[PDB]
Structures are given as C-alpha cells and as structure tokens.
Amino acid sequence: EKTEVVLLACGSFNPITNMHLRLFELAKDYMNGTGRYTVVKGIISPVGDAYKKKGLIPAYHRVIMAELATKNSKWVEVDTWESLQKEWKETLKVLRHHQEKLEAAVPKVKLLCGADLLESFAVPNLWKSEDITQIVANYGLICVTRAGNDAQKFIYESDVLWKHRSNIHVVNEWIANDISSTKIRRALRRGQSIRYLVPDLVQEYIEKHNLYSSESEDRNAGVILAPLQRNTA
Amino acid sequence: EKTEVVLLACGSFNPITNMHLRLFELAKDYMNGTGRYTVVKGIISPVGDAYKKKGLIPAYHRVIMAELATKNSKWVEVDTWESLQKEWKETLKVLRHHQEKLEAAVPKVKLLCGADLLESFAVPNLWKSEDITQIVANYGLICVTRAGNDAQKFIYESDVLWKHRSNIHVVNEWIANDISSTKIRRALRRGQSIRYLVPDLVQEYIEKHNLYSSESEDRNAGVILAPLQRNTA
Amino acid sequence: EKTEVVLLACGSFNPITNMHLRLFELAKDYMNGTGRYTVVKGIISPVGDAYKKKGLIPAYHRVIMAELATKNSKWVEVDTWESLQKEWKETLKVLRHHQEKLEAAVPKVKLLCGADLLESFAVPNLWKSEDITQIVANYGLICVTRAGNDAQKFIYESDVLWKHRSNIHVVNEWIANDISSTKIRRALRRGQSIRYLVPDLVQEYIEKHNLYSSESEDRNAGVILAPLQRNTA
Amino acid sequence: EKTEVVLLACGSFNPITNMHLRLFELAKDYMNGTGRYTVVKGIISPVGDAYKKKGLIPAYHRVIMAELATKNSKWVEVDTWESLQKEWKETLKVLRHHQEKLEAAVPKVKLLCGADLLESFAVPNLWKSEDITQIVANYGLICVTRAGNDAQKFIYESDVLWKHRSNIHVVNEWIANDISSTKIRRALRRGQSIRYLVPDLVQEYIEKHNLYSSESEDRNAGVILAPLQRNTA
Amino acid sequence: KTEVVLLACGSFNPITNMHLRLFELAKDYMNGTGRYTVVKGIISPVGDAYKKKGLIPAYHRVIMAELATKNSKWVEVDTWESLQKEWKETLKVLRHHQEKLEAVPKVKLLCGADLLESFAVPNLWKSEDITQIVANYGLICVTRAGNDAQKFIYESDVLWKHRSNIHVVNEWIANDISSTKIRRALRRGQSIRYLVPDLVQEYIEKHNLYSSESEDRNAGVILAPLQRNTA
Amino acid sequence: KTEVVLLACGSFNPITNMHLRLFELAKDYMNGTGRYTVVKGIISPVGDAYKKKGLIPAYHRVIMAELATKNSKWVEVDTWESLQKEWKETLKVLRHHQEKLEAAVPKVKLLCGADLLESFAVPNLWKSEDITQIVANYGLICVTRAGNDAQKFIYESDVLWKHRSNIHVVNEWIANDISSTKIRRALRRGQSIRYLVPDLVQEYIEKHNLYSSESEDRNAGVILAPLQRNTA
C-alpha cells in the first residue's frame, strides 16, 4: 500500500558529521510519519575527487569516515560508486544509477539533502536546467532544514519546482543543529575538540591521521568546481 | 604558573544530551586557550528531586544517564553529592561544597553554564542577591552560548556582574547545536528518533526504561520550584 | 479516489473583507492541488450576537454583507445557522451541525481559518482542551497564513496538534495581505476609503448605513466573551 | 486656497490589480486629509510596448484592463497618450504632457508611486539625474508604501530628494495587501485563482483571453529595457 | 509663518549631548518646512517632587542644563518647574509657558518617542491631558524609530485625529546617549567625555554626582503622576 | 603592567565626537583589564595621496583633529603620515610610531572600529602579510556596537583567530554612530552639526565652509591608493 523509499544523500562529506546522520533520522521519521511511505534504506554516497571542490581530501578517506559513522546503523549504508568515478558524475546520473540498481514493487530512490543544496539550483551553471526538472519530476527531494519557509519560498519562486512540489518534501528541523563540515575542519586546524559533533570513531580516525589542516584546505585552490567547468564549457 | 580549574555544571540533566558534553569541551578549549589556565577536570552534578521542577524524572535515572554519558570521557565525571541531599541545595552551596572538597596549589572550582542560567539571575526570587555576588566574586562563571552579545549585554546591565566581569568568561559557540532536554523529551513522547542527539548508552537506557512521556512531563505539576518557595517565604 | 471536502469558515466577519474571500480561493487551490481532495463547497458562517465580542454589530447586517460578498461566487455560500443561535455555539458544535447536515461517499467538513485563530487555542479558557482535540482529530483544519513557520511552529509545540498534524494543512499565502476587519473599522471611523479592500457591494452597504463608528465599537464594552465566560465559570 | 491636484500613475499595469487602485484611494485620503489639497482626478497611464520590459504583454490589453478596472470609479481614469507614442517616453515627459494638457487657477499634476519606483532612482542609467530633479522640483511625488521608514531613508540618503522633500509625500499604508503584478502572472501560469485580487471584470477579461503564460512571460527576453538602452548608448 | 517656542520637559538626570541634539534637530525641521520659525528653546528640568528613582537634586540638574546651554544662542533653561514644590503636569507646564509668552509665539512640547508611547502607560497621563496637549499645543517628537512613533499615532484614534499637530522628526544619526547609561558609566568610573558637553562632564567629575547611592534615591516610592492619578 | 599607546589611522573627514569617544572607550577598557596602562593616544590623519572620494585637504583635517584634542590631556595629533608624498600603509605608520617611541618601551596598538577590521577582507585593500604583521607584532583594539559582528569576523579568519590574544574587542553600549559621512551630508544641507563634534571643530568648519557638493566630488572616479598599489 505505502510506497517504499530509499533515501540517497550525495555530498562531499568532508567530513561526515552528526548532522549528516541526523538528516537520515529526521527524513525517515518524516516520510514514515505521513502514513504514505516506508523508508527501507538509506545510502550515503561520497563524491569522487574529480568533483574538485576546494579543501576536498581524498575520497577513500571520506568513504572510510562514513563507513565508521554508519558502522552501528541498522539501515544506513555507504555506497562507493560515485567515489570511484574518474569523471565527476551529475547528481541526476547518480539517482539514475541507484534506481536502476534497485530494479536489477520496486522502492523509489529520493534525494535527501538540505536547504542549501536546493537553493544551489539557482547558482549559474551549477545545474543543467533539464537536470533539475528530471530530478524533481522523476525522483524527488527530501529537503531537511531549520529554515522551512526559506525553502518553501524558494520552491514557490520557481515554476519548475512549484509544479513538482508534490515530490519535494520539506522537513522541518526544530532542534537547531548546524554542524557544518566547514566548521569541523576549521575547528581541527585550530586544535579544538570536535568530540560529540561527529561520531567517536570518525573523530578518532581524523586525529590519528591529521586529515585536516591548512594544507588540505588548500587542495584544488584556484580550480573550477567540476559542474561549473562542464556547464560553462 | 597557570591557575588549575575544575569546571562544575549544575542542572537537571533531564536528560543529558550531546550538548551538555559539548559545553565542557568548549569551555575547556577556551580556558586552556587563554594560556592562563589548565582545566583539570569537569564535574556534572545533577539536581536532586527536591528541586521539584516540572517534568523532572527521578534523580537516580538522571544520574545513571549522566554517568553512562561520561563513561567514555577521560576528564568529565558525575558527582552525586547534591542529588543525595534531602533538601534542595543552592548552586552557591554546591560550588562551596566542591571547593572545600578540593582542599584535602589548590584548583579553583568555576561554574559552567549557558546564557539561560546567567539570565535567570533576574528572575524574581530565583537567586538570593548575595549568592550571585559570591558566585561571581569568589568562584567564577564560564558562560557558553550562541547568543554572545545577549550574555555580554546581560553582564553589562548588572552592576555586580560587570564589577566582577574579569571572573566571568563568555564563550562563543560558533557551531550551533542546541539540543535542549525539552526538545528531547518532546521527541521521545512522539516516538521520534533521538539517535545522534544523545550518547548511544543514554539512548539505550532511555529506551529500556521507556523514560519520558506525557505522565513524566506532568510530575510536579503545580508545585512551586524549590528556590522560589524558599526565597519567597 | 479523492476525499470530497467542504470548507467551513467560522468568524465574526465584522465586516467581511477581501482576505476572508481569499482564504477560500487559496484553500481550494491548495486542497485540490494536493491531488488527494476535491473541494465541493465553501461555507461562510457568521457568529451570532450572543458571542458578545466588543464592537460586534448586529448579526443580520454581518450576514447580509457576507451574502453580498459571495453573490457572484459559484461555490462559496453563507449559512445562517450560527447567526440564529440564541446561545453562542462552540466551533466544534458548528462543525458537528454541518457534518450531520452533509449526512442527509459523504463530504468531510473542515474548518478554514488563519493562523491567528489556530494560535488562539492557547488563550486561557478560550477553547476547551477536549474541543481542540476533537476538532483536529475528527474534522480537520486548513490554516492559511503569511507566517507559516508561525503556524508550523505552533503545531510543533503542541503534542495534541502535532499528533494530528496529518489533519492540519498549513497553506502559505505569498501575496502578503493583512486586511483585518479591525483595521477596516478603524479606517471607517476615520472617514477613510476602504474601496478595493472589500467587495464593492459591501463597501456600498456599509457606507449607506454608517454601520461602523465609535458607537458601534463600544458595543459589548465590559462584557466577557461568551467562550471565556462559559469556560471560566 | 487649497491647491487642486491630479494624481498621475505611470507603470506597466501588467496586469492592473486591486492594489494599484487602492494606491489612488490612499493617496487621495492623505492629500485631502492635510487640509492643504484637493484631489480632483487620478490618471492611470500605462507604458507603451516600446518600453520593452520582459513579460510585458501588448498595451491594448493592459489599457483595456485598466479601463475595465476604472469603469466603476468616479474619479480615476485611464489616459492613453503615453502608450500611443511610438517611442518610449520618459516619466518626466509624461508628467509635462499632462500638466500642459490641463492648461487647456490650474491643478498641479503629481507623480503617484510606490517605494519600488522611488528607489529605482538609484539604478544605474534607469533615470537621467536632471529628470529626477525636475520631477521632484517641478511636479511632486506621492509615495505610498508599507515600508514608510524605508522610503524616508531613501529620501534622506539623496541630496536631490532631500532638497525638494517638501514636494515629496510618503504615505503610510497600514492595511497592507501587496498584490504585485508579478505574483498575479505567476498565479495565472499555475492555474491558481486570482479572484478578489483584481477587479472582477479584469479577472474575467484575463480569463476570456487567456492572457498570461510561460510564453508571454518570455516576451522581450534578452532585450534591454528602453530607458537603459537610451541613457547608456 | 508661525513663531514657535520649543519646550522640553524631563529629568535631565543628567542632560546629555542627545538632549541638546533634540533642539537642533527640531529647529532645522520646523524651520525647514517653511511654515514655521523657531524663536526659542526652553529646557525645563522637572522638580524633585516627581520622585523618580535615581533622580538627583534639581539644583544640580538645573546647573548642568545651564552649563550645557551656556554657549547656546537660542536655547535656555527655565527653572520654574524645578522650583515647584508640588509636581506639575506637563500640560500645566505648557500653559505656564504659553501664558508667560503673552506678557504671540506658540509653545510646542519637544520630546522623544519614549515620551509619546508613555501615553499608554496606565495612569501616567490623564486622558484629557493627552487630548489637550496634542490638540491645543502640539508635539515635536524626535526619534530613530520613526515608524515606532507613526504606528503608535496610527493606533490611537485621539493622536490620529490630531496628527497635524504631532510632528515626527526622524534622526538618522543613530545616537542614544540615555541618561541611564551615563549614570551607569559614572558609577563604574568610566569616562563620559564627548557624550555630554565638556563643562557638564567636568562638573560631574569634580563633584562625584552619580553613584550607587544616588541611584537608590526614591527607591520604592511611586512616581508623582502615578500616585496623584491612581488615588 | 604593559604601557600602551593607541594609534588611530583614518581620514577623519571630519573628526567627530565618536572618533574621540573611541579613545576614551579603549583606554577605559585597556586600563580596566588591570594588565595595561594607556599612556598616550595618537590621531594620525591619512595624507591626500589616499585619494579617497570626498577627502578634503589633509591640512584642514589635521587642524580639526588638533582643535578636537586641544583640551585632551592624553590624546594628540601626529602629522607625519599626512606629510608623506606617497600614501603610507597602516603597517608602516605603526612601525614609524613604534620606532619613534624607542628613543620598558611602550607598545603601539592600532585603535579602530569594526568596519576597518572587516575591511581586511576587501580584495586588494590589504597585503595579507601586512595583516599578519599588524596583529602579531602590534595588536588591534577594535571598538564597536556590533561586537558579535567583529567576534565572528575574527572567528572566520585563521590568521586573526590565531592572534586573537592580540585583538581586543571593546563593546560600546552607548550607541554613538556619528559617522563623518553623515556629518558631511548634514553640512551640505545646511543643518546644524552642533553637539555631534567639538564646538571648536564645529566653529572651524563653519568659518571655512569646508564641506559641500563640490568637495564630496574630489577624486571622483580615482582608484583608492591601496587598491591601486596592490593591483599593480
């Protein structure tokens, strides 16, 4: 009766934090709460290094931190397909990849994300307009956020999003958590504690290997983010 | 050279969450960061049932969760003295109890709190005025908050806090993660997940004893908060 | 397939304005837009004089203004049942009266209101707690507003509303209005035009009978609102 | 004794809405209210197609809607001069034309506008600086807005406007209902009701001719707004 | 062109650059409409009978006001209200000054939005006093929160009805040197140089006028207006 | 207890009660920490080579600064910077004054508002090595009403955060925003600026009719010296 859903979260996870994990908890409670869906699985998909984002450390490490973070998760797992791509892959292709994989009574894959990601649809050249359309019309978004009217507004201001609003589920986050990866790296560079902001095993892995520093933050400096490069050219 | 410091936090811890542990980490980085102090220990002291606060579940439950929460901490521990007293004890007595206990070169106990508690100083009949003075003049306050200017202002607006401002340290939390006990109890009453908001051992203990509910929320309904009863009469 | 719905707006309509009529258009588009409902009728039900609200003019006139306002509406009508009650009737009973009437495959009546009304649920004694419960659980509320996180938040802070959140639909209204009856009456007493804020026929009816003045505003001065008097005593 | 005044509003009126008409009502109450003026007429002057604004439908439709909107008004009418010119006309010329036309103890024509228009004086190349000076110095400006202190600040920040401020009247709208033309088109594209947001005859005219759509919104896409083209090149 | 006399009542406990600033702002504004001509400014310190918490001796407040205006061509201090052994309503102070001028310029009350909004504080003003002040004299209300004052006026049928006699003067230079904050600064021994005129600063320092003790004067005592009007 | 000298660089166009208030606030703060003793305050107006739009002749600015502090027991004016032919970096001004004191030696600290601090992010306005040296070897006493604005600006910058022990954020609780810009605007419109600046500065401006639409246009279109030098 209810539609089975698989939550897919793409992102750089640089590094993964408690907020990324909360995203799944919140979305699951929300989708299951509607009485219309059954969340069967969650997937964390770290982006490959060809994404070229500034300060992005090696994919293998981000994949290991995510596995450590979901070690004790009964329903959330890590998928490495994206991390292994020599050519950065569009989110639309990742969704397609996962939907097809499930096909091989079939659960539907929905993109799990936050407000920022939804709003980035308006950054020039970051997304191919046709991609935005197929993502909302054929897959769906589960957008979690502390600024719900911020997202509702953004959806209202765009004809394509408004038209497919039935597939964009905005999930309010009442507990104010804004544990960004960027503030974690900043904390690490300064020798500050990040305990209780990221799983214990992740924090331990990061400190053991000094993964984050001024130097790592410099990776890809002056380089153009893959999507931008490819959509402008 | 450096003044050694023991950070003490009184509160209901109903229940303890990642945020209370996070307060300790933050306060310690800040105090050690000044170069003028060395934080040798943190103490979590749950309030005894005589506090009579609404929704306050039994102290043994709150103490065990706080103990489970700090089990894997190397410097934060729980002290049960206050929870075991038959009569509710003023924060100043708790600070004094602990300061004396250390005398037996001697570390200074300092109160660790959020802006809310600092602000509660103005609540009529909540604090004896000589208490506030002794606390800030003889012990000290380490006030952690996301609303820095709020606290700075509160201090600026009181002749006494301002006079002793050198003994009051406002610590800014740039990684906003406000996991209140109230929001946790609300989530629990609603069957929502609190995974990653509190230590796994705390969650497991909450689950096993089905701790928070509409009925628990009702405890002490209509009773008058202990310090209010005492200071009024 | 789709659930048929009848929207019922209770209120003083003192006087009815363009925003009251907008409520129906918005709600209808929203409900039919979900693809899960079919709005078959709108009902404006002006409150009887026994409600005793300060400044409330005779019900006969409020009913006439509502009739004139919906003269050209194909689906929104006026029901006088409430206006004729010698004893003020609780909204729950009005809802019940209309649902029973429909039972003579049966459409469901839902209360159409704005966020102000939803929030009035917290005014001490204004609403019987069990009434609120039965309204959200057995009928439903379609709440329109320019402050949706206003309403969303109000629902999140109440266990009973949250529990029945599936029966409460928040409809964002992006075209920022704010045309309260109270400001229309203030305008009239000041001899200001209210054309284009209310239907032409309503404006003309008001002008012809000098309905609103300082005298009309004093009606019921010093009298307690019916629900308050009945729930307190 | 009292200076007679003719309020003139230039604009695209694409489409006209209840808000554009309320604007005249408010300004009239204000100007007459001061005891120093007598408003004898209001003129809506739709901009011609040569303005080249994106999404601007043909002037005949906009003029007709505007006439339908004012058919039932006793003092506000539509003037077509501006729209009949082959070349887009500077607002100052439109004002001059009308002042001259009245000289055929003579009423003063004053520009009637919202805050948006006022603030557009800062847009690079949108207005020749001598035009601004002449408009405010020789005719006058009646600025109706819900952001009164906003308009006041904009005037304070400009030497030109401040110097002639006695000829600028900021009228506060306390009964806000910002029904922008942009939001009306947005609603039309989406099949949403606009009943009670525009005069019934406008609404019916739009509906009979299916006026707004994705296609109309594209008109002049990529074409440079006439004033910009003129004052730049 | 109507001649206007700006009358400012209040504690001036102590007078600050902001109070003086009020006159300059109002003058430029009224004179700027072309419909008026400001001829004089009168600072009138309230008498000690007002009984407001922290109010120091009128002798000092009068003296500081005089020092503040010593070099003022058009603003002066009127010690009448101060020498009143019985606290006088603002209306009566306006009358006193109107009647004094006829022995003809119109006296208008100069003030801030606080004072205007205080019309809503229970029993602080006799409603007929409000009506007569706005109706028969006029308010020149200076403020940084202009919409604060406009909304307050819009919300009251009485003030609205007399809106033409209530001139709201915006002040765009965000400065709010309240007396309260000057006292606070002095109790804590911080400098207030450049927030009040040099002579008032020097006067205050030389006599250690403000303190925890001076702040406690009249503690627990009801405000004159509140007493008279409630009983 | 470390002896300190507060040095304020800026256009001072014109100086107002607020710039003066800035010194009083910082000195009270610094002395109140019980770790410092503020011995002197120096106001140093930028030279005309700054080329900032609306910047009137440096000589007038210096004189108003002198009149403003004529009665100041501890704050004085220094024309060295205004007399240089080429616009001088703040780092060089600080250095020049620290070297002048060396002739138990007092430390010169830059006194500024949040704007200047935040200006560190303006592209090409400051050499990054210059920022590091100013904060590491001299220090910043930043006065402001938006304390969290500044605290946050510091928190977001690794170099500033790193040297935060040398950056003191002093909260101004008595809002006192008398910007030079608003003073010039008021004067152009003939409004009174009495009690916004010291009486003597006010009298001087009046006597010389200093600010006008015309002066406000000085250097119109000219690129600010730092931006010019750092882009080339």
Ligand SMILES: NC(=O)c1csc([C@@H]2O[C@H](COP(=O)(O)CP(=O)(O)OC[C@H]3O[C@@H](n4cnc5c(N)ncnc54)[C@H](O)[C@@H]3O)[C@@H](O)[C@H]2O)n1
């Ligand atoms: N297909 C395309 O054209 C395209 C353009 S960008 C893009 C993908 O978008 C991603 C960008 O990742 P990133 O590093 O910028 C983001 P990051 O990895 O930090 O975020 C992962 C997810 O968590 C969300 N999130 C983060 N913090 C919060 C919070 N505090 N509250 C609620 N939600 C939160 C983010 O919006 C995101 O959806 C990449 O995976 C990239 O491949 N696809």
Ligand SMILES: NC(=O)c1csc([C@@H]2O[C@H](COP(=O)(O)CP(=O)(O)OC[C@H]3O[C@@H](n4cnc5c(N)ncnc54)[C@H](O)[C@@H]3O)[C@@H](O)[C@H]2O)n1
């Ligand atoms: N001595 C007295 O007169 C007196 C009056 S009240 C009082 C004591 O004060 C306590 C009040 O406890 P409670 O249950 O209300 C508080 P709770 O137990 O929730 O808080 C514990 C501590 O965390 C702080 N804190 C909480 N959330 C945050 C946050 N999100 N960010 C930063 N800091 C935060 C609080 O200020 C407090 O210091 C009691 O234990 C009581 O004994 N003493």
Ligand SMILES: NC(=O)c1csc([C@@H]2O[C@H](COP(=O)(O)CP(=O)(O)OC[C@H]3O[C@@H](n4cnc5c(N)ncnc54)[C@H](O)[C@@H]3O)[C@@H](O)[C@H]2O)n1
């Ligand atoms: N059953 C009870 O215990 C109970 C308590 S009060 C109550 C009923 O509640 C009603 C209160 O009526 P009233 O005069 O206070 C309200 P009014 O008649 O002014 O409003 C009618 C409806 O329009 C809504 N509304 C008005 N303006 C807007 C706007 N600008 N934007 C969005 N929505 C708007 C209001 O929320 C309301 O739902 C009465 O009918 C009363 O009988 N029932």
Ligand SMILES: NC(=O)c1csc([C@@H]2O[C@H](COP(=O)(O)CP(=O)(O)OC[C@H]3O[C@@H](n4cnc5c(N)ncnc54)[C@H](O)[C@@H]3O)[C@@H](O)[C@H]2O)n1
């Ligand atoms: N002369 C020039 O150099 C010059 C440059 S632009 C210009 C003219 O200015 C015009 C602007 O056209 P447009 O498309 O923006 C007209 P639009 O139809 O959008 O607006 C008409 C008027 O209503 C006002 N208004 C709108 N909404 C509100 C509201 N919600 N509350 C209060 N007031 C409101 C607007 O500011 C405007 O004055 C054009 O007609 C153009 O010819 N003249």
Ligand SMILES: NC(=O)c1csc([C@@H]2O[C@H](COP(=O)(O)CP(=O)(O)OC[C@H]3O[C@@H](n4cnc5c(N)ncnc54)[C@H](O)[C@@H]3O)[C@@H](O)[C@H]2O)n1
């Ligand atoms: N007649 C009555 O019923 C009545 C009630 S209160 C009253 C009189 O009202 C006065 C209240 O004096 P007080 O001590 O409370 C006020 P204070 O003396 O501090 O203020 C004097 C004036 O300056 C204004 N002002 C203050 N700060 C600002 C600012 N930052 N910006 C712009 N304007 C500002 C105030 O509103 C006031 O008009 C007294 O003189 C009292 O006699 N009369």
Ligand SMILES: NC(=O)c1csc([C@@H]2O[C@H](COP(=O)(O)CP(=O)(O)OC[C@H]3O[C@@H](n4cnc5c(N)ncnc54)[C@H](O)[C@@H]3O)[C@@H](O)[C@H]2O)n1
């Ligand atoms: N060295 C470099 O690379 C570099 C780039 S810009 C620069 C210097 O920075 C200066 C900029 O001067 P300017 O004319 O832009 C600023 P202005 O002269 O107006 O300011 C003087 C001082 O007052 C502070 N201040 C201003 N308003 C307030 C307020 N309201 N509250 C608290 N404090 C305040 C300012 O930050 C500044 O430190 C110049 O002297 C210039 O030489 N150095």
